[PDB]
Amino acid sequence: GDFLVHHAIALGLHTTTLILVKGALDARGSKLMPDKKDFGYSFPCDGPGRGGTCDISAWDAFYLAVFWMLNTIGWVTFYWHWKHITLWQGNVSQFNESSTYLMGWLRDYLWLNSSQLINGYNPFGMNSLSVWAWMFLFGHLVWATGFMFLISWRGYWQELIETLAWAHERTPLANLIRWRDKPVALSIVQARLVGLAHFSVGYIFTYAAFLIASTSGKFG
Amino acid sequence: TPPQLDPSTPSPIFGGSTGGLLRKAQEEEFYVITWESPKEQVFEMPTGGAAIMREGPNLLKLARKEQCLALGTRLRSKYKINYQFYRVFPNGEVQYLHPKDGVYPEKVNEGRTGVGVNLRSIGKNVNPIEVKFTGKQVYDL
Amino acid sequence: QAALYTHHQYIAGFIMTGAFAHGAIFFIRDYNPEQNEDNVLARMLDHKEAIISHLSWASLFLGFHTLGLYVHND
Amino acid sequence: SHSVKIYDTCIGCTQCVRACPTDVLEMIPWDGCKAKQIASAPRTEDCVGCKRCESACPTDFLSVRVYLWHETTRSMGLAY
Amino acid sequence: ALRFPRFSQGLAQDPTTRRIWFGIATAHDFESHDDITEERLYQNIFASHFGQLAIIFLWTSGNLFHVAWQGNFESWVQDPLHVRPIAHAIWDPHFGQPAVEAFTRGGALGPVNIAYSGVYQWWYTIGLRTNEDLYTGALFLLFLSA
Amino acid sequence: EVKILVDKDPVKTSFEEWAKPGHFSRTIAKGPDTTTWIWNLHADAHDFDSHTSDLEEISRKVFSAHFGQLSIIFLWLSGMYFHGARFSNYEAWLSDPTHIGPSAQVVWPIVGQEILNGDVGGGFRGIQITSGFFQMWRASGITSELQLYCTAIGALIFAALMLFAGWFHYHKAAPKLAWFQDVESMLNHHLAGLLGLGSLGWAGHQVHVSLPINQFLNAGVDPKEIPLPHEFILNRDLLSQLYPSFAEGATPFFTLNWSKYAEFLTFRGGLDPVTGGLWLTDIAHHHLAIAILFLIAGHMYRTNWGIGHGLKDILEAHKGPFTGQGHKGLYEILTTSWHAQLSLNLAMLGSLTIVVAHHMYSMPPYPYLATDYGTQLSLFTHHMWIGGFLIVGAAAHAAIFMVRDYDPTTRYNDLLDRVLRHRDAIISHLNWACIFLGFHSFGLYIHNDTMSALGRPQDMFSDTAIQLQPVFAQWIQNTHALAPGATAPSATASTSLTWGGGDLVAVGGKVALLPIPLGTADFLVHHIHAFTIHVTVLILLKGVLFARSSRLIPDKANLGFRFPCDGPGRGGTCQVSAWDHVFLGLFWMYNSISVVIFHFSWKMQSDVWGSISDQGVVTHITGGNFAQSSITINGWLRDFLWAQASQVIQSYGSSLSAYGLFFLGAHFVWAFSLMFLFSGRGYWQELIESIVWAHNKLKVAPATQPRALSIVQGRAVGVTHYLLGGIATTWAFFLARIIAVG
């Protein structure tokens, strides 16, 4: 069971270094953008020409590699937590037999250890684990909110904000109030940063709540 | 060429829409496109809907320069009509924009001086460190 | 123990991404090709393709075979 | 206002000028190419940065380059 | 620059909300600020490092003070295998009565949080034994931050 | 004049264009230079109006494509009947439908996969099916495997017929454009001919083959001693014993004594207690009335004789002080644009599928369908998904019509013009409605979660707390329960058991249907549904209305219907095309349908489905936990997702092991989609640049230059994988849960 998870960790490491090294070594330019150094470390793109230039800057390579870093660290932390929680319970054989296939990870680690956490508050009362139960769903919600910024892009939101500006300008008793900064949608690079921040915050909080609650419901 | 002035010519027949001018025209600027038509005819509006252009002079006020140019290129391509447009400020000042020289910009013309022309290939721009702690860009040199 | 291990590993993961991000920023802002002629730092830009392709091969091999073994066991 | 620059690899096919949505570019006389004309950008204050000119550029690499710079009400395409 | 940010004139003339968002996001990129010099860059970084150290000292002083004030360190050093360490107290007006009862752990008289940072074991190992020791450590760390 | 108009031998039948990929378009026919070509060939395969500008040429192509689709559907039906006849336990299920699970698929003994042949009962091993074919076959009167073989053969013959018809009508007799534009004749024939005569024939089959055989089956006689269907036509005496009225012949029909047929033509309502489904005598009368209604309806329009209506005449006479010229000009639009008709038909079909899904669970038409929970859940979810997809396609093709076929200079319409002149007001109002609904629906769940987490159950929105009762739906239920007595006196029972008539139908110790109670939790989920529907409508309507132009892009029509962007200018112009709006609205349609099916599953397992003992006590699958647990997000996470996933995660080593494997595979594909959704092609082209170097170093670089996927194609791949993984996760989880516990 350890042999497979160690190679998963190695794959995660290699892929993350691949992304980061490719971003660093192509920062000054490439065949698609020979003059990349002339635009800086962080720029949105080079436009729809030459086939399309989405996420061509070096900052975008880091933005992509953060997801792989999070996935790799999640793998190593899952491994550590599952290997220790079974050792503290007196039955290592649960990990030895169930870690060789991924359904074992899904059922005997995630599903099995979330029984106490999700029962922090229920229609029959609450206990001291309710904070972690609330934070579990809080992290889920933030993680899902990040998908909005990571999937939907700017033009849809700008065209929608135009209609809201018209609606405010035509509403009685609200024309008396005027904005001082013109409302615009988030920038292309700004939205990537915001979505990545939401993704990372949800990723950290969900696992922190799950780990603390699962290790504190039974104390190993 | 001496740019033409702005008369009080009529406007196309239109029922009104929510896509017209907003308070930005009141405080910052708006644009005016004028053309001449041989007959009354339907034309799509850049703000949505269809209007009727009258025969003779036609004047239309819009919020952006891009709207004026889009309508102008549509007129030139579909109706074969020459057009002009101007920028109008809240204090009544009118600035003539296009066609600037009296000739459309895709056609070469004498009297124009190049702005932003670099006498080098794009691959000969200097590295950022050479312009570090100076206020200049590599492409401005 | 679990909280400390997870905390420190996630911090290390973020720091290691920062190390490469600033290394990338150096190549754009501070790198002087003329003052680094044919030293160990220019040769990396010389065979970046060989480096990237080999990293891609290693990652592809690891992913293919690890996932295949996991799915076979499943 | 964004920055639009023209390099002497221009062949003067006037493709950028007729792809401009805000009339930023124009053609001026020249002697460095067979067409005897080169592009110029005298009205970059109306530039929006859509980079439509670079999509119409036939030269390799591009002869017209757009650099996104300080943002104004004209450059963000705001009508309100 | 006449408005915010004052270090970027180009951002200051932006008439949209983007002027604010970007002003926060480029505050510590000293290299791209208006009229920046190498001497100013190095001096600003040197100054910022001191503020970071002050924040680090203040955080540790706060942890020590709260452990000494609302914790159960003296009762924990007598039963480390059966006393749950306390980080700090809880005062939330939104709490209900079952929440007040459920969060009264350790030997506390009200809702508290159980510390999982391992500061109790670390401080017990290095010789600290009483609440007064933590109190005088917190004052020293505040002095260092100042 | 309305007459047949054809052209002889318009296109020669040859294999020469099969050997030239991309022949249909000017650009693609030249051959590939990069890999993008390979994708462009498949994306433009069925974009007929982009191949040619001739309306007649396009129409002939769609006419033949429909024949091809019909042939494929006939092949699928033939396969289903053949597998029922050859690899099924239908004949054993007929004699014991309450204890035997339907199965029509048997796997081969290879690589250990033979574990999927589970014990479905009746001395048969196979895969349990949830299509509901067994109950439909029992309703139709099918009793032996031989009649299924004949149906399979007939369906094969019909598939061959449709394929030959498609070839003949594209290559030999191609109808002219005037033939297609004869909309009045088409409407008349589809209303009276197709629907009316089809329903009349089905009614005849029901009163002659279905009613007697099902009367024998419900009486408890062996299927192998029921007289054959033709025996009920040969000697009418056999038919005069179950129903003596048949002794009178057709005299009562022609003399207008219809009450004499009350034996087999009824207005009952409710369900058959032996069967648990609608009375067959009710269904036959329903179809006989529908036949007359449609036959009369199909006589409304004028084709060649003076009588009838003109569609243009009706359209041009509907105008008012608020709508100008009115509907004038719509006849020209709908007779010259395939995309507008496709949009309208897709919207109507998608809406009708959802109605079918809602009506089939509340009024089970087929025998022994209500107590087969796996079939009911599967049918409901399947039809909900089909309806949602068709509805999204409606918006896509409306946007396509707006981009391509809209022309105010030649095809002006006042209504469409006036809609386009106040689109800002429509979109802003829908935005406000979406925000208000999202707050006042989802934030109540957050309020409940926070109150429960804070130890304040008395401050929540619940039936034992601050109440939010759906009084309007409760009043409608009470009104429908009282219908048989005051407003539908000829009806014996209400149209459904769920209205509240205080009765429950039990078949084989299992609850078929019972009055469904509505409370605060239902009030919450219904407004959640409304919020998601409104957001999907907002996304799609904004794309349709702003496809031609916007204040950001005055000339969005020249960019086409499907383009990535208009550059990073104006702050950023990503996903401004109408295609992107469909791409985004697919996610929200998925979200809405997922919430609807989750609601249905939990409610049915908690308050309707269950078991009943020979004491009169009902025990539901989850014991009525919906009312107090479905009011918090933690309740959905714990008592629905965590509790009911316990089946699919412990299915390894059993006959349900294929659902856990599909569970994991769907999770994997859903995660895989995020690589495409979160990135862009500029990184991938640069990465490919390095691999191309490695290939060139070893002289293995292909001539077809590798290209990263286009900006639009990456979005399509991401959304397709996202939808596939998400829908398959629920498919596996639902099927495993409802087969193990149902």
Ligand code: CLA
């Ligand atoms: C010793 C460590 C160190 C130092 C001195 C710097 C210093 C610098 N970095 Mg850097 N960096 C670091 C570590 C460091 N970094 C690490 C570890 C990473 C990887 C994560 C990065 C990634 C990084 C990028 C990608 C970039 C920089 C940039 C910069 C420069 C400008 C920073 C700026 O504008 O701040 C502005 C920073 C912010 C406004 C922070 C945003 C808020 C974040 C997302 C935290 C949000 C937390 C969230 C709200 C929590 C919610 C909780 C919930 C309960 C509500 C500056 C020279 C930028 C630059 O100019 O490069 C040329 C740039 O583009 N760095």
Ligand code: CLA
């Ligand atoms: C679970 C989701 C998932 C998966 C499986 C992958 C997989 C991969 N990513 Mg990736 N990625 C993801 C999410 C995911 N990513 C997300 C969310 C992001 C953030 C945007 C990224 C960002 C990212 C970057 C930036 C990079 C990668 C790279 C890679 C590749 C690394 C090499 C490898 O593992 O080879 C193993 C390959 C696989 C596991 C792919 C699956 C192959 C299947 C199982 C075999 C075929 C099955 C069957 C025959 C097909 C039939 C289906 C159909 C024909 C009917 C690999 C293809 C790197 C790369 O390209 O290196 C080569 C790279 O540079 N990814």
Ligand code: CLA
């Ligand atoms: C939508 C319709 C549909 C579907 C999904 C199925 C599905 C199935 N049928 Mg089925 N069937 C159908 C319609 C359908 N049928 C119809 C209409 C009929 C009436 C003619 C039948 C008659 C029928 C019979 C009689 C049997 C099945 C069987 C099966 C099962 C196994 C099929 C198999 O392995 O293929 C067999 C494999 C192939 C046909 C090969 C695929 C050919 C493609 C073109 C690739 C060719 C490459 C080739 C294999 C390589 C060698 C070529 C050579 C040059 C070297 C499978 C569940 C079998 C079963 O359930 O066994 C228990 C079985 O015995 N079916």
Ligand code: CLA
């Ligand atoms: C008898 C054989 C025959 C022959 C030689 C031709 C020859 C021709 N036809 Mg024709 N056709 C035929 C039968 C035939 N047809 C039939 C039976 C129909 C009725 C459906 C049509 C309907 C038809 C139309 C509507 C059109 C043609 C066209 C053409 C021309 C080019 C088509 C081409 O490149 O095909 C190559 C394409 C294929 C081989 C694709 C076949 C795909 C099949 C039909 C669908 C099966 C897909 C199925 C869902 C697979 C699912 C599994 C998958 C997931 C793996 C060419 C002259 C076109 C034309 O005139 O060009 C301008 C045209 O518009 N034909």
Ligand code: CLA
């Ligand atoms: C009573 C007459 C009648 C009937 C029954 C139909 C029936 C049908 N028409 Mg149709 N049509 C009619 C008159 C009729 N039409 C007239 C008068 C016109 C000209 C105004 C059209 C113009 C027309 C178009 C343009 C299209 C249809 C289509 C369809 C099919 C819709 C798909 C469906 O519901 O599948 C139901 C499937 C069945 C009921 C299976 C049985 C198939 C039936 C029995 C075959 C119909 C035979 C036909 C009426 C006469 C055959 C000619 C003869 C020489 C053999 C359906 C088969 C669409 C289609 O799919 O095309 C293929 C389509 O695109 N029709």
Ligand code: CLA
């Ligand atoms: C009867 C319904 C119907 C019809 C006739 C059409 C017809 C058309 N649509 Mg359309 N559409 C429909 C329903 C329909 N659509 C629905 C329901 C939706 C919403 C999802 C859409 C969304 C849609 C968009 C967004 C677009 C079209 C486009 C088009 C046109 C080009 C189609 C083409 O070349 O595809 C070629 C076919 C393919 C490339 C095959 C795609 C394969 C799919 C993605 C895989 C499906 C997954 C599969 C079920 C699972 C298999 C598992 C796998 C392991 C084997 C054509 C006129 C395009 C256009 O330009 O119109 C002018 C366009 O941009 N449609």
Ligand code: CLA
């Ligand atoms: C769970 C993740 C999530 C959430 C919460 C949202 C939320 C929203 N999306 Mg969305 N979206 C997401 C994921 C998500 N999205 C993803 C993954 C995609 C990609 C497919 C999209 C794509 C998408 C599109 C394309 C559209 C939306 C729209 C909307 C808005 C609908 C209006 C509404 O309900 O406002 C109500 C607000 C909420 C329900 C948010 C939760 C608020 C609760 C009540 C807590 C608030 C308490 C209080 C304010 C906290 C203050 C404390 C203080 C300290 C700050 C809303 C802001 C639409 C829109 O803008 O229409 C107006 C729209 O067009 N989204």
Ligand SMILES: CC1=C(/C=C/C(C)=C/C=C/C(C)=C/C=C/C=C(C)/C=C/C=C(C)/C=C/C2=C(C)CCCC2(C)C)C(C)(C)CCC1
């Ligand atoms: C003694 C001993 C041993 C050995 C050990 C060793 C030898 C280790 C090593 C280790 C190592 C050896 C590690 C390393 C690591 C590395 C890294 C981690 C790196 C990173 C990098 C980076 C991050 C980069 C960056 C950059 C860029 C990108 C650009 C340019 C600039 C710079 C540089 C900034 C043994 C085992 C036998 C046993 C035990 C004892």
Ligand code: SF4
């Ligand atoms: S979409 Fe984003 S990335 Fe693709 S072109 Fe427009 S801006 Fe550049």
Ligand code: SF4
């Ligand atoms: S940026 Fe857009 S507008 Fe300015 S020049 Fe290049 S193309 Fe013409």
Ligand code: SF4
């Ligand atoms: S496009 Fe290239 S060639 Fe045509 S004008 Fe602009 S620069 Fe000169």
